[model samples]
Target: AEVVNKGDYYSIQGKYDEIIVANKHYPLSKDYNPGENPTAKAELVKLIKAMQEAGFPISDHYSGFRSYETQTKLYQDYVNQDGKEAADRYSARPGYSEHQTGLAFDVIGTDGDLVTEEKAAQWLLDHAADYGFVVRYLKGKEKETGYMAEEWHLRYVGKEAKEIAESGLSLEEYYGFEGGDYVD
Candidate 1:
């Protein structure tokens, strides 16, 4: 759960317009697009290809949870009054949401809900670390992740950190601290 300061440079702009998805490029400040950082944009393609090659279904939506406008609504829809209140008090600001990293994605189902097929989800959960991704929040670590268990949501923190996180330890537990105390 510890937030590593990969330095502000690595921090995404969260403008949403900077996001590039599936060969489509969005410009900065574009209201509806809400793009991701440059490098992360490319990595997303790699993730999709890797997942698809591994036999997982790739959702059409490439990103979510990063927009100043959209993320708030999502937070409200998912977190509700109590969660929103808590987010107001302690969550990462909307612009700072991990989805802005572009390296993260929420694979969806044909039903349009967040997909949670164990085969696909676990496939990513098991091997995402190899590709520098992590299941940011686990089923039992809501208090630490500031969110609920989202089986399809994944975050990229590079291979080193991903490996550590995938080892059955919460990021906080792996780091031997409460949370947000790692030196990236």
Candidate 2:
């Protein structure tokens, strides 16, 4: 079992890896770059398979090395935050992002389109709990996530925890704590 102790920032520890540092200014992969990691790969494979079985159109924006440029574009075109600010606030720096954890991923659609309202995205948001995942940043929970709504983002926290988090309760509310105030 892995335990993610709180530091000055959030640390995402994969079930098969060690706890690594992640800060608001830096939340990306070290070697693989942003939006790239093994955990995300594994989890995405599962999610895509499930979506395909459900006859939903799953996009491919969740994988690969998302450059600072691409991250900026995503923020500008989709989330409406300042390109740099959104990238800094939402995306993890090369080695600091949870995308590096390999367990978290962004699900999108064709034409590099934002998947926020996509059928596949909604399906995952609705059923991710069954797969031990959850939509981490909610629309009104920006203060807790330090960002805006991310419909395509999913966090793997195990089935039990996922259920608790998805029961119309933010992680902060369910845990009875404030944002960035947690220990494991």
Candidate 3:
């Protein structure tokens, strides 16, 4: 894939197609809020069922399609709670959030603890790719993804998810993009 600089943000386009690049360095438009992607939602539902069948208590949080305004509030709340420096490590600044692309979401643990439990998380780590999703932030990839490992946060990258899952690389490294700090 190739990078297309779009003033305030960068759009990636190339052989693999224009997959939305939302991270610390690549921002989406402030008004670029598409509702939850249909395919992504469907795929998530399928994954949830698989987890259910396997006896893992996980479900959708319906936390996808975050708008810039919503993200602003979320980031500011985190900034106030933990200070900007700490908040920036885990919370994205509005347009820089992948959720704004509508292809990402955070899952909820129906049992109230499964989301953070490794037993359940390991299932995702090993199987999310089969459902067109990948655990966006991986352990030991904070430098590359600019966020703490979030086992429940899943990003849909279509068919390429299989390759990415096998690579064990952050989306940034897998795409050869820079990360780890805010561009602003």
Candidate 4:
């Protein structure tokens, strides 16, 4: 398993084979900002369009990149509402969020709950990989991802996405990271 120090700043910079795996470990620096990857944005648009054509009615891509400052406030709010333990299971601590990389987005549906919308969620599961996106946190794999199941969260990992999807492995698992399975 790959040994990753949670406090390492340099580990989060740039792209590793077009893959960026940010989590509780391998946190990004507060100043790091790629500001919305155009490639990811374009692919998101295509994914949205394809979903619409398939009549899934998913909402447009709205929540994309987020600064570390914004993430701090958001994570704090979640902690305040749900307590730190619960919040940490879902919210990233500031620089640890994938949103900071500009390659992750939240796919909301018109009905508001993308998590429970079977058709919309299924559409993403079937097609997001085609556009170089992964569901990121999968259900029943919360232990591996350091987060609860987040059907709305999509992460861009370039061509490796399809392989990940087919293998049903989280990024941590794919990289042989020391956590989750490593911990167990």
lDDT of 4 by residue, 18-57 (tens): 3555776567888887799999999999998888788876
Candidate 1: minimum summed lDDT over ten consecutive residues — where? 19-28
Report each candidate's C-alpha RMSD, comma-separated, in the order given. 8.9, 6.1, 2.0, 3.6
Superposition error at 179 for model 4 (Å): 4.0
C-alpha positional error of residue 139 in candidate 4 after TM-score superposition, expressed in Å: 1.3
Over 4 Å off, model 4: 1-16, 180-184
lDDT of each candidate versus the true structure: 0.53, 0.56, 0.83, 0.76
TM-score of 1: 0.60
TM-score, candidate number 2: 0.61
Please tell me which predicted candidate would have the highest lDDT against the true structure.
3
Which residue pairs clash within candidate 1?
1-172, 2-180, 3-180, 16-34, 16-35, 17-35, 19-35, 19-36
- Worst ten-residue run, lDDT, model 3? 8-17
Candidate with better TM-score, 2 vs 3: 3
Alpha carbon lDDT at 17, candidate 4: 52
**Which pairs in model 3 have colliding backbones?**
none
Candidates 1 and 4 compared: the better one by lDDT is 4
* TM-score of each candidate structure, all chains considered together: 0.60, 0.61, 0.91, 0.85
Off by over 4 Å in 3: 6-9, 14-16
Question: How many clashes show up in model 4?
Answer: 0
